Design a protein around this ligand. Structure first.
Ligand SMILES: N[C@H](CCC(=O)N[C@@H](CS)C(=O)NCC(=O)O)C(=O)O
Lengths: 203, 208
């Protein structure tokens, strides 16, 4: 399966951790946006939204949005290991609702406000610190972001985001639960060293 | 189930339509925000029969299908197909709605209607917002619904709530033929479309 990506990119890193978790090997297709590779007609025909990560499966199914990719990887490839899929993406409606809630929080608030503050300011700073405070509150008395006894795809997505906060230069130790979760989760998730490595070397 | 909401809110309206679709009656609780009435004070907030608290409209939408619609397997399958590939397209459209379509709407219009009330729209934000509409128009080329299928999915409902907000904002949706066609057709057929239209009008109070 072809994986159109950039090394420093958080959503790409989330997908790489998820693929490693389900034993999927990705055919890496570096897609340099500065060079305009995502705007070539070959890419546009695959993905009209011209964004990375983009996954092309064995039957030519094309998918983008890292968090939809994560779910697809578990449902289609993780499913061969029943307990594994359950750990990554619990099936109970309530448990799964929380995983979804955290994924939507990651894209619309946590990573969003990171991009709002760092890519162009006291206003967008307070906006971002609020996102971190929310996350800190989510992790109060909890090992993982959506609960559970094991990391879920929500942890993997937020690990990608938070490693970007770290390399940006934000003092994460300010959020005791976030720092704690970040350290312990990075130590236990397969390919999490590649996440930080890739955040650092590129991002 | 208690539903903490405001009619003007697109995320709230997406849940109302989804609940209508699964035959769930919501006990509506008006939560006036500018007054200050879930440690993120997010609306909508759903509180189920066991006191389980959920926010994030799109997570709520899925939960409503999975728990309250799944007795009618054919209905749940229509709203939220289980085939990984089909479900993946529905998930990508939900993520697009939150992070691209509604997000760029907000980034363009919120500075003009809230806080400082900037006298003019940012052209870069406008271009970006129009790009989001073009994407949607493209997704709808040759397709009845946003994520495909023979029937509306929850992605259609989420986007319907967002697009009705574009309309009350005064954006000329006729510029995007597929979007307009889909918007008319879907508004004509989905449960709770009346709540969506009624509520979107309310959000028009910020555009006078
Ligand atoms: N919601 C994000 C989208 C990430 C995204 O928009 N990718 C950026 C680079 S990190 C990109 O491809 N930008 C180029 C473009 O959208 O035209 C995801 O998790 O996949």
């Amino acid at each position: 399966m072809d994986f159109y990506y950039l090394p420093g990119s958080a959503p790409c890193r989330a997908v790489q951790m998820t693929a490693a978790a389900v034993g999927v090997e990705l055919n890496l297709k570096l897609t340099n946006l500065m060079a305009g590779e995502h705007m070539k007609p070959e890419f546009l025909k695959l993905n009209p939204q011209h964004c990375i990560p983009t996954l092309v499966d064995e039957d030519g199914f094309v998918l983008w949005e890292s968090r939809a990719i994560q779910i697809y990887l578990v449902e289609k490839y993780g499913a061969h290991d029943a307990d594994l899929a359950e750990r990554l993406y619990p099936s109970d409606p309530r448990r799964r609702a929380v995983v979804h809630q955290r994924l939507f929080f990651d894209v619309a608030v946590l990573y969003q406000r990171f991009a709002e503050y760092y890519y162009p300011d006291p206003g967008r700073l307070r906006s971002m610190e609020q996102a971190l405070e929310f996350l800190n509150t989510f992790l109060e008395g909890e090992q993982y972001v959506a609960g559970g006894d094991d990391p879920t795809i929500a942890d993997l997505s937020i690990l990608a985001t938070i490693a970007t906060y770290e390399v940006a230069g934000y003092d994460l130790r300010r959020y005791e639960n976030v720092q704690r979760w970040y350290e312990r989760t990075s130590a236990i998730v397969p390919g999490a060293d590649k996440n930080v490595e890739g955040a650092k070397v590129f991002g």
